[PDB]
Write a protein that binds this ligand. Structure first.
Ligand SMILES: Nc1ncnc2c1ncn2[C@@H]1O[C@H](COP(=O)(O)OP(=O)(O)NP(=O)(O)O)[C@@H](O)[C@H]1O
Ligand SMILES: Nc1ncnc2c1ncn2[C@@H]1O[C@H](COP(=O)(O)OP(=O)(O)NP(=O)(O)O)[C@@H](O)[C@H]1O
Ligand SMILES: O=C(Nc1nccs1)[C@@H](c1cc(F)ccc1O)N1Cc2ccccc2C1=O
Ligand SMILES: [Mg+2]
Ligand SMILES: [Mg+2]
Lengths: 291, 285
C-alpha cells in the first residue's frame, strides 16, 4: 500500500528542463540519482506552485498514497514525493509528451486506427478509475500521456477547466464518474479535431449559458455520425443518460475494428498501425509493461 | 519480426562506452521516423554475407528470458551495427569493483542465481555463449542482471575451459567453467583471475591441477561449487540447472554461505525501493 509511494530526499534528484506548467504546478524533466550510484535516470517532476505546511502535507500525502496505488496499463501511477517547502511529485517521464501536443504535431500523419485506439484506451483507463471509485476531475487531451504512439495513459486524476467540465460541475461543483464522461467527450473531440480549442472564442464565464441553451461542440470534419453521436451522448444534461465508460470501451472497440467506416480521413490508406516488428521494437526500448 | 532493420538516418552514436574483442559499444540515440523524440540505445559496431549475419542476428533477437539480453535491431549498410537496450549501470564486473564495500551476500548469491538462469535458458536453446565473464553480464538494476554478447563468434584464455584452450571445444559444459570464473570474479569483488600470469601459461597450470584461490568471503560450500566448474572432465561439471538450485538454496540463508563484514546490514531493497526501481527502469516480467 504505502510501499507504493517512495519518499525522496532533495539530494537524490535534480530538475533539468521546464516541460510546461498547469493549474497546480510546473512539470520538469528531471534526473533521479540513486544513493551511492552513478546513474542519472530521467523522471518527470511536478513542483506545486504554492508552498504548504506540515499539516497540509498530511492531506497531500494521503492523496499521494492513493494515486500511487493505481495498477492499470492506461493509468499513470504516482511514484514518489519530496516534501520540500514546495512539494515535489515524481512519476515516469513520457518523452512523447501529452496527447494534445502529439495530435497537433502529427495532424497530417494520424490515421483512423490510432485515433480510435486512443479513445478505447482512454475509456479503459477511466473505467478502472471508476472501479477504484476515483473521480478524475480534470480529464482532457493534455492529461493523456503518450508512452508510445500505440500506448497512452491518463494522468493528473483525483485532485478551473470550465470548457471541459460538465454543466453540473460548473453550476454546482458536482464531480462524479458521469461528469468525467462529459470530459471524456470533450477529450475525444480534441483528438478528432487534431487539437482544436473547444468553444474557441467563447468566454469561459458564458459557457454554462450556451450549454443550458443546448449548444454543444461541433461535429469534427473527420467524424461520421456514429462517432459524433457518442460524443453528444457524453454531453447530455441528465448525467445518468450519458454513456458509461464500459459502454464506451465496447463501442470504440467495435469501431476500431473497422476504423475507416467511422472516421473519414484524407490519405488514411497510407498511414496504418505499426507492424508487429515496430511494436516489438517500441516495447523493448520504451514500454515493457504488461499491456 | 523480432529483428528490426534500421537505416543509418534513424540512429546516431554519441559517446563510446567501451570496446572488447568484437567491437566498440556506443551510447546512441534512436530517432523514430516522423517523430521528435531521441531514445537512448546501445550500438555495438563490430569489425571482422549479410544474409548470414542476419540469420544469426535473428537467433539473437529470438531469446526470451528475463536474464538474457535480446538483440533488438541491426544496421548492415556499412559496418555491422547491432542495436540493443542501453544499460546505464554498465556491466557487473565494473559494478562489483565500484561497490566492493556495499555488496552483501543477498545480492551476490542472487546474481549467481540469475546468471545461471540465463545460461540455463541459452542451454535450452542450444546456444553456446563462448565468452561468459562478469564483463558480459549487464546490470539492468542492481537487483536484475542479464547475460549479453552470447553468440558473437560470427581470446579470453583465463575464462575458457581447458578443452577449449587445447582443442577449440565449446559446449555448454565449457560455459560452466566460465560461469565458475564469473562467480569467482563476483566473490572477489572484481579481481583479475590468475593475475600476473601470462595467458600462455594457463593451460600448463590447469593441467598441473592449480585453480583459482578461495575468495576470502566464500565458505567452503561456495568454493566447492566453483571447483566443480573447473574439473577437467566436462561432464563431471555441474549443470546450469543444478547451479540454479544450489545458489537458490544458499540465497535462502545467505550469511551461512558468505562471510562479509557488516553483511547483516546490506540487505535487498525494501518492497518500496524495488517498486520504485521497477517502475522507472525495469517493467519486464
Ligand atoms: N509524466 C510526464 N512526462 C512527460 N511530460 C509530462 C508529464 N506530465 C506532464 N507533462 C507535460 O507537462 C505539461 C504541463 O503539465 P501540467 O502541470 O499537468 O499542465 P496541463 O496538463 O497542461 N494542464 P492541467 O493539469 O489541466 O492544469 C503537460 O501538458 C505535458 O505535456
Ligand atoms: N547494452 C549495454 N549497455 C551499457 N553498456 C554496455 C552495453 N553493452 C556493452 N556495454 C559495455 O560496453 C563496454 C564494451 O563492451 P564489449 O564490447 O562487449 O566488451 P567487453 O564485454 O567488456 N569484452 P568482450 O568479452 O570482448 O565483449 C563494456 O564496458 C560493457 O560493459
Ligand atoms: O504528480 C502528478 N502529476 C505529475 N506530472 C509530472 C510529474 S508528477 C499528479 C498525479 C500523478 C499520477 F501519476 C497519477 C495521478 C495524479 O494526480 N498528482 C498526484 C498528487 C498527490 C498529492 C498532491 C498533488 C498531486 C498531483 O499533482
Ligand atoms: Mg496535467
Ligand atoms: Mg561484451
Amino acid at each position: 500500500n504505502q510501499a507504493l509511494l517512495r519518499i525522496l530526499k532533495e539530494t537524490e534528484f535534480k530538475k533539468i528542463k521546464v516541460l510546461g506548467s498547469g493549474a497546480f504546478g510546473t512539470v520538469y524533466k528531471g534526473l533521479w540519482i540513486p544513493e551511492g550510484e552513478k546513474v542519472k535516470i530521467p523522471v518527470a517532476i511536478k513542483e506545486l506552485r504554492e508552498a504548504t505546511s506540515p499539516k497540509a502535507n498530511k492531506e497531500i500525502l494521503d492523496e499521494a498514497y492513493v494515486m500511487a496505488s493505481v495498477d492499470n496499463p492506461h493509468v499513470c501511477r504516482l511514484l514518489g514525493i519530496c516534501l520540500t517547502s514546495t512539494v515535489q511529485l515524481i512519476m515516469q517521464l513520457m518523452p512523447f509528451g501529452c496527447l494534445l501536443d502529439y495530435v497537433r504535431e502529427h495532424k497530417d500523419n494520424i490515421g483512423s486506427q490510432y485515433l480510435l485506439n486512443w479513445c478505447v484506451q482512454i475509456a479503459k483507463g477511466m473505467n478502472y478509475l471508476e472501479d477504484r471509485r476515483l473521480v478524475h476531475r480534470d480529464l482532457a487531451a493534455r492529461n493523456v500521456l503518450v508512452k508510445t504512439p500505440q500506448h497512452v495513459k491518463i494522468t493528473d486524476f483525483g485532485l478551473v477547466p470550465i470548457k471541459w467540465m460538465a454543466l453540473e460541475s460548473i453550476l454546482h461543483r458536482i464531480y462524479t464518474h458521469q461528469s468525467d464522461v462529459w470530459s471524456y467527450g470533450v477529450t475525444v473531440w480534441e483528438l478528432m479535431t487534431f487539437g482544436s480549442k473547444p468553444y474557441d472564442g467563447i468566454p469561459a464565464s458564458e459557457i454554462s449559458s450556451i450549454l443550458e441553451k443546448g449548444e454543444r461542440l461541433p461535429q469534427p470534419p473527420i467524424c461520421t455520425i456514429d462517432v459524433y453521436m457518442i460524443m453528444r451522448k457524453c454531453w447530455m444534461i441528465d448525467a445518468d443518460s450519458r454513456p458509461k465508460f464500459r459502454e464506451l470501451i465496447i463501442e470504440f472497440s467495435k469501431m476500431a475494428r473497422d476504423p475507416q467506416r467511422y472516421l473519414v480521413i484524407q490519405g488514411d490508406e497510407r498511414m496504418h498501425l505499426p507492424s508487429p516488428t515496430d511494436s516489438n521494437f517500441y516495447r523493448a526500448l520504451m514500454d515493457e509493461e504488461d499491456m
